[PDB]
């Protein structure tokens, strides 16, 4: 070993920096009292037992856990419940370590968060203290289904970092962790109280394989994404309809590894005003307008792709600046007859704004704020005007957020957050795939959802049909299996 | 031919597709686009997850609705035409006749998804003449596939040198001949004759815990709350039925832990009550569920005698209401019933020879109506949950045979249906078991099971009975962690 105790910078001799969250970074107290005397009285009595390793690898949650826990303690339920408030109450920022935290990431950057925390904690945890700001990727045992003592959960992040192991020093108070850190080859650094001892799947790869095969056959046979109706987001008995251009633009829109001669043939089928409809021309009702949800997204792949310029698109962007409401909102339809908002809507519509460089007008000051109040008021848990699904508003915002870096700092933390309480809360593929994006490029490895999602792949190599739009008047829902496994596809790929 | 042959096998094993079952698969309905032949469908990749019983219809025949390009509606239309060509092979069947009066042992094995085999089994009358009946929604296993071979020679426990399988498919003899088994196939002209640990430690960690857990509480704990969790439940522990129900229901319990657990109970009527005598409301009565669970253990472990219990069983067949049916309680003021209370009455009067004594019937009838008119959906007055009275009920109907045979297929049938169809362990337990009596194995909710045990070898909390005035449910880990290890300890 080497016990160091002043002012070092055997730190800056390493390229990679992990860090725990206990004792390193927040320290807790664990005696605590309540008007009820029987049972223990030491929360730590509770963490140190096998039914918290549950709890920590996300099998369970805190209502489960302390009612096993009220039985193997002999505890009154409500009471280790407090023991347990008061605990996280205590949580102290250890302020030097936090400062070195700092100083690091003002440098060559390259730390990971790797700590066994349960995942409603960890929410609270993210939203109480500042410091993950410096992290580069946040590890959370209750996101991975993995425990810190077992070499698996090593061996994950070392993949997914993708981090030279002789380039790493791995920082920890507990000692079995740093001796499973060393067996890697990762030198090691205790945090005792005045010291700092120094020291120094295939079955993936055949899915992903599998179901980009059943993709590229599907929109090879039809570059016109097809899309069946219905009236549940399951499409159970759902029928053929095809014909409406949206399912194509999302697709085009959002899976990245489209083989060229796919993206040719789809942007083919689009260019077919610089304003777009919801339906193919042959399907249209006479006198049906154009709205700024199927151009805004289509506008932003042509910009993105270079196939067309600013210029090009500032006289549709002027148009949409002009579609607002008495409130100042822009609206989803070129109909003043057809007044209508959606939140998902804004966000694309906001989009298109800031790649164009109008993302400071004065003009779109409303819209951004309902899309903000939106998400802070919790209203995007009903859905928006044809988006049932949460997670949806939650995907396409943190694309407005991430890829806009300076411009919505606000919405930052808050959609992180609401991400993270999601995290494993439904079933449907596309629903997971959303979640674990969003996380993803918020810097959250969300290898639960990733998990679960390989399980529902059909064994064509497509997923289950997803109705991810709906046609409000008669709640109709749209969906295709090409949808579906276009965002797992796109899941796997940014994990893997 | 004459098949002396098969005399010289102790064990056969038979598919039923073409070997048993035909079926034609071209049909039309009045929808023109799409396919017009069902074996596009069950050829497609697609069918292979909806018999591994890993996605039901439904969501097959959307899938294939959309790969296939045809009407979804059109594709349902045709799957219950060609279900509704089935013809049994009379030949075969009557093979299998002759091969179960010849006393050997017979087993299926076939790819089939749950709800066809629910329709097969209700539909056709040779299930009888089957030991263990194996199909692959059940198993989340398909037939090609070395491991559902591999998984009947260890369920089955299968000499591979005396057993003979029997198929109308080249890959599936191929596999049963690697692992030793002798293949004889199948057609219309020609008949060719050739020739994981983890559940250990699973299993082991779990007893363990149920072991420390009744030395240290012999009366089983018990633990009180609203909801079927148990979610902030308080401690309660008072009442004596969940000792009686461990004692009765967990086949592996150390003698130790049966000795102090019988001893608890004992503590001269030969009638017990709901409570622990330190917590009985003054008044209270004496209840016939309590009473049957345990002289029902006494008898079966010889420290009583029919004769000692006779006494008490003649005051319940003097114990019914106007309707004719047994009561709860041994108290006029307290006119209650229960279906599960009734099997359990009904469970104990055979046990002592009193099977046939006129004055049950009305009480046996109540339990087949509730049955048969699916009511048990509803709960008991006392047992929320549909499976606990399928589970009793089968307790009943397997160990008197020839006495409950009305229920047999029927309640089978009921299993069948509700294989993995709730997340609770004690849940699923209860219908592994269950079906497992019945001739059929269940490793779907097996392996889901293994899924929820906690880190310290212990199952989760649950909800087993209420009182029905306050709507309490009573539980605990003890209950749950006992019939998930006579589950696992039934399926190995
Ligand atoms: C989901 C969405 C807003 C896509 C952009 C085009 C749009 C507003 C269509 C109206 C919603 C709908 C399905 C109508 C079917 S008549
Ligand atoms: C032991 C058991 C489940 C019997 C089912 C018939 C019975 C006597 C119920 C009384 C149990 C109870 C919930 C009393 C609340 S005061």
Redesign the interface.
């Known amino acids: 070993i080497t016990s160091l105790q002043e002012l070092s910078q055997i730190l800056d001799r390493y390229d990679t920096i992990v860090f725990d969250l206990g004792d390193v970074l927040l320290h807790w107290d664990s005696v605590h009292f309540t008007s009820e005397t029987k049972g223990i009285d030491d929360v730590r009595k509770m963490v140190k037992?096998?039914?918290w390793?549950?709890l920590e690898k996300g099998?369970?949650n805190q209502?489960?856990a302390?009612?096993?826990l009220?039985?193997?303690l002999?505890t009154?339920?409500?009471k280790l419940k407090e023991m347990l408030e008061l605990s996280i109450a205590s949580l102290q920022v250890n302020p030097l370590m936090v400062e070195v935290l700092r100083v690091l990431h003002k440098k060559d950057k390259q730390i990971y968060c790797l700590s066994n925390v349960d995942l409603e904690s960890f929410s609270y945890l993210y939203k109480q203290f500042d410091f993950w700001k410096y992290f580069d990727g946040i590890y959370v045992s209750a996101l991975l289904q993995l425990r810190k003592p077992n070499p698996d959960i090593f061996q994950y992040l070392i993949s997914s970092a993708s981090i030279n192991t002789k380039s790493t020093i791995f920082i920890d108070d507990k000692s079995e962790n740093l001796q499973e850190a060393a067996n890697f080859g990762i030198s090691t650094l205790k945090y005792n109280k005045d010291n700092f001892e120094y020291t120094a799947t295939p079955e993936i790869h055949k899915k992903r394989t599998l179901g980009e095969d059943y993709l590229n056959l599907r929109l090879r046979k039809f570059p016109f994404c097809?899309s069946?109706v219905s009236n549940n987001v399951?499409?159970?008995?759902?029928?053929?309809f095809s014909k409406e251009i949206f399912s194509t633009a999302v697709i085009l829109h959002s899976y990245t590894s489209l083989p060229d001669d796919i993206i040719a043939s789809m942007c083919h089928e689009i260019l077919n005003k610089l304003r777009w409809c919801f339906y193919k021309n042959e399907a249209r009702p006479d006198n049906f307008p154009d709205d700024l949800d199927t151009t805004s997204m289509v506008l932003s792949f042509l910009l993105n792709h270079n196939k067309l310029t600013i210029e090009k698109i500032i006289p549709v962007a002027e148009q949409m600046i002009a579609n607002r409401n008495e409130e100042g909102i822009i609206q989803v339809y070129f109909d003043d007859n057809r007044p209508r908002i959606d939140a998902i809507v804004a966000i694309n519509v906001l989009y298109l704004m800031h790649q164009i460089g109008y993302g400071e007008r004065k003009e779109l000051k409303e819209t951004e704020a309902f899309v903000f109040d939106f998400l802070i008021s919790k209203e995007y848990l009903k859905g928006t005007r044809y988006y049932p699904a949460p997670d949806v508003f939650l995907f396409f915002l943190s694309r407005l957020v991430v890829d806009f870096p300076d411009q919505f700092e606000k919405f930052h933390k808050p959609l992180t957050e609401m991400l993270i309480t999601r995290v494993n809360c439904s079933t449907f593929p596309l629903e997971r795939a959303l979640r674990i994006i969003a996380l993803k490029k918020l810097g959250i490895v969300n290898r639960v959802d990733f998990l679960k999602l390989l399980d529902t792949q059909?064994?064509?190599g497509?997923w289950?049909?997803y109705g991810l739009f709906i046609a409000p008047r008669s709640n109709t829902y749209f969906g295709?299996?090409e949808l579906s496994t276009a965002f797992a596809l796109e899941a796997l790929h940014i994990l893997s």
């Open positions: 037992h096998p039914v390793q549950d099998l369970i209502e489960f302390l009612t096993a009220s039985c193997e002999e009154p339920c409500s097809k069946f399951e499409l159970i008995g759902g029928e053929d059909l064994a064509d497509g289950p049909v295709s299996r």
